[PDB]
Design a protein around this motif. Structure first.
Motif, PDB file in Angstrom:
ATOM      1  N   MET A   7       0.369  -1.385   0.005  1.00  0.00           N
ATOM      2  CA  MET A   7      -0.221   0.214   0.216  1.00  0.00           C
ATOM      3  C   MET A   7       0.712   1.052   0.050  1.00  0.00           C
ATOM      4  O   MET A   7       1.898   1.404   1.162  1.00  0.00           O
ATOM      5  N   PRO A   8       0.776   2.198  -1.307  1.00  0.00           N
ATOM      6  CA  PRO A   8       1.449   3.189  -0.908  1.00  0.00           C
ATOM      7  C   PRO A   8       1.316   4.273  -0.048  1.00  0.00           C
ATOM      8  O   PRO A   8       0.251   3.850   1.037  1.00  0.00           O
ATOM      9  N   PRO A   9       1.857   5.971   0.007  1.00  0.00           N
ATOM     10  CA  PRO A   9       1.498   5.810   1.191  1.00  0.00           C
ATOM     11  C   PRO A   9       0.032   7.043   1.628  1.00  0.00           C
ATOM     12  O   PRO A   9      -1.390   6.463   0.712  1.00  0.00           O
ATOM     13  N   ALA A  10      -0.558   6.877   2.461  1.00  0.00           N
ATOM     14  CA  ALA A  10      -1.817   7.811   3.302  1.00  0.00           C
ATOM     15  C   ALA A  10      -0.674   8.989   3.799  1.00  0.00           C
ATOM     16  O   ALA A  10      -2.543   9.534   4.891  1.00  0.00           O
ATOM     17  N   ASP A  11      -0.225   9.938   2.993  1.00  0.00           N
ATOM     18  CA  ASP A  11       0.262  10.721   2.947  1.00  0.00           C
ATOM     19  C   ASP A  11       0.695  11.694   1.855  1.00  0.00           C
ATOM     20  O   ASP A  11       1.028  10.485   0.809  1.00  0.00           O
ATOM     21  N   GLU A  12       0.771  12.750   1.890  1.00  0.00           N
ATOM     22  CA  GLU A  12       1.456  13.846   0.753  1.00  0.00           C
ATOM     23  C   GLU A  12       1.842  14.662   0.627  1.00  0.00           C
ATOM     24  O   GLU A  12       1.174  15.338   0.990  1.00  0.00           O
ATOM     25  N   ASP A  13       3.173  14.838   0.890  1.00  0.00           N
ATOM     26  CA  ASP A  13       4.395  15.694   0.560  1.00  0.00           C
ATOM     27  C   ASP A  13       5.144  15.717   0.076  1.00  0.00           C
ATOM     28  O   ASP A  13       6.579  15.852   0.359  1.00  0.00           O
ATOM     29  N   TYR A  14       5.460  15.050  -1.094  1.00  0.00           N
ATOM     30  CA  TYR A  14       6.305  13.722  -1.305  1.00  0.00           C
ATOM     31  C   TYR A  14       6.590  14.613  -3.503  1.00  0.00           C
ATOM     32  O   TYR A  14       6.634  13.843  -4.211  1.00  0.00           O
ATOM     33  N   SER A  15       6.420  15.721  -3.352  1.00  0.00           N
ATOM     34  CA  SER A  15       6.048  16.528  -5.123  1.00  0.00           C
ATOM     35  C   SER A  15       6.872  16.894  -5.632  1.00  0.00           C
ATOM     36  O   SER A  15       7.212  18.814  -5.254  1.00  0.00           O
ATOM     37  N   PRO A  16       7.831  16.410  -5.577  1.00  0.00           N
ATOM     38  CA  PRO A  16       8.993  17.011  -6.463  1.00  0.00           C
ATOM     39  C   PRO A  16       8.610  17.932  -7.944  1.00  0.00           C
ATOM     40  O   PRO A  16       8.034  17.645  -8.363  1.00  0.00           O
TER      41      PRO A  16
END
Lengths: 16, 71, 71
Positions: A7-16
């Protein structure tokens, strides 16, 4: 969102 | 030339499967980063940044290369 | 869903040094390509496509990984 598996992230501040 | 942040804001220090990866992206130390950062396209829709400091990252990433190469 | 071309239609027939490579990009077979293509980006702000079918490509690319990792 449905792309995952119970299961990939249940959070997201990984936007290059 | 004042302030530049690395491409990866943070790194996803949590294991997950290589099945979700379709595109890989590696950016070496640049005018914004004095190190190295592994990046990957997430099939959910977004992007994701990995930390080569984790062993599971060198593995799920290694498989992607062995899979895209064998294809 | 009618016609989709691979991200890389042509390749580079001139071996070079990773010194000009700052960013690497690898895209596995997608809904547009049924194979694998290793894309790359030069510091000059340019983007080309390499053919993993050439030995010099596996080398200059291998060095980039060993260089971005040792960094």
């Amino acid at each position: 969102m449905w792309d995952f598996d119970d299961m990939p992230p249940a959070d997201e501040d990984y936007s290059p | 030339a004042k302030e530049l942040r690395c491409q990866c804001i943070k790194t996803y220090s949590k294991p997950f499967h290589p099945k979700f990866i379709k595109e890989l992206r590696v950016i070496e130390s640049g005018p914004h980063c004095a190190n190295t950062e592994i990046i990957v396209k997430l099939s959910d829709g977004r992007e994701l940044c990995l930390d080569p400091k984790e062993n599971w990252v060198q593995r799920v990433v290694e498989k992607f290369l062995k899979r895209a190469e064998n294809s």
